[PDB]
Amino acid sequence: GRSDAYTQVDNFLHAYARGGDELVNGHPSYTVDQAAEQILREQASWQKAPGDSVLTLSYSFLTKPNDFFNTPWKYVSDIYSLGKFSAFSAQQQAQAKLSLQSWSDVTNIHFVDAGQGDQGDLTFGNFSSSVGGAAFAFLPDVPDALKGQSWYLINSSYSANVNPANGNYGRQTLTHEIGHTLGLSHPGDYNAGEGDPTYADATYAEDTRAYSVMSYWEEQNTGQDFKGAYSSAPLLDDIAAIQKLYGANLTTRTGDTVYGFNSNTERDFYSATSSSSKLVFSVWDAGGNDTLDFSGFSQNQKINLNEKALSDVGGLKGNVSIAAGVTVENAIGGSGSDLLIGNDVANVLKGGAGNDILYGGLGADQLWGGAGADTFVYGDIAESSAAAPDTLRDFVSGQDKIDLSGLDAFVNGGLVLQYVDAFAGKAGQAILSYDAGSLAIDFSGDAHADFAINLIGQATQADIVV
């Protein structure tokens, strides 16, 4: 029967499932694309005039009240006095630029610094008298006198916007409000200051802060846990939504990029600095050989290298994801007992310390167990072909395990392995060799190998689980 090691792989491959024909939390479950469409329901966007396919938008930080601040009721209904005006502080301006950068990273927009004043296509400013919310912005379908404007609440009762920083609510709010100015809405028909909106009023299940920064609702609603942290940058569904409007940015991080620990992203939200770092990000990456490095964590982690998939990283749940259309090649686990699932291409998987379960998937994968009793799992024959097999780079006999219990020939076929020196034309015959080693199995029974695994360090029959 199927081993527990295989079961854990299969369960995490289908973890945080979306789509499907059943109601989730009393809502229909949406795919990433369906969620993106709903986010863009207002059909609001900036029109490309200087050049198509690439948009250029200027931004500035107001130094004095504008015409809208002075008399809001002349322009908008149900907004009267915004209180005291204050310019964006030095910290606010630097964090706004990082929020702006995180948007331009993922889509074809170039943000130009227009300095201090009312110059920019997008403007930023603080207000003190709340209109039911912590901040507000206008979508780009409004008249020119309001287009691009975002406003943020600062008073003695609300201080979240005063000191924005990586992982806090002040930063997310900035990313959220700029999202509005670019043309994104809340994933549901709800608004702060209007009645009593809850997660029950969402249009779809994946309307949480695990999938979109435009959402009001906490990640716990869809089974995630960020332990108090907020996403600083666009999440899975945000990326899909904004790319529908202004395209995918295929110039971003085209070289070999490391995410998590030892990061070369130069992005605070993509980077881990200590064993306590609370990571929340969705990877947008245009090309190259890329690595998820979570070696500095001690907790038991679950890492999924497939696109659109969510991972459990550094004591958090469903906090790391990979954007649609992104290929990430490599994963490095921490000192805890980790689960590492690869994707369709060639993957380098490193477990590190602890008892790790590695699943290369399709392609010829380089699998490092590290210290401890590690399990290398196979669910399909095509995952390690005789012509292009996996390599187990640090296999230790009597400690590590080759798991084949999930294979169709064992679960349903009822096949028993016969270890031999030559294939006589029988199903299940296996040749185990050593010099460096190799395991080659003839599952069909045509005297030719259809499944193989390359070995660095010898393996025995006892190291193979069926």
């Binding site: 907004i79 912590a134 912005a137 959220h176």
Partner: peptide, 6 residues
């Protein structure tokens, strides 16, 4: 006429 945040 705008779109507040929670």
């Amino acid at each position: 006429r705008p779109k507040p945040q929670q």
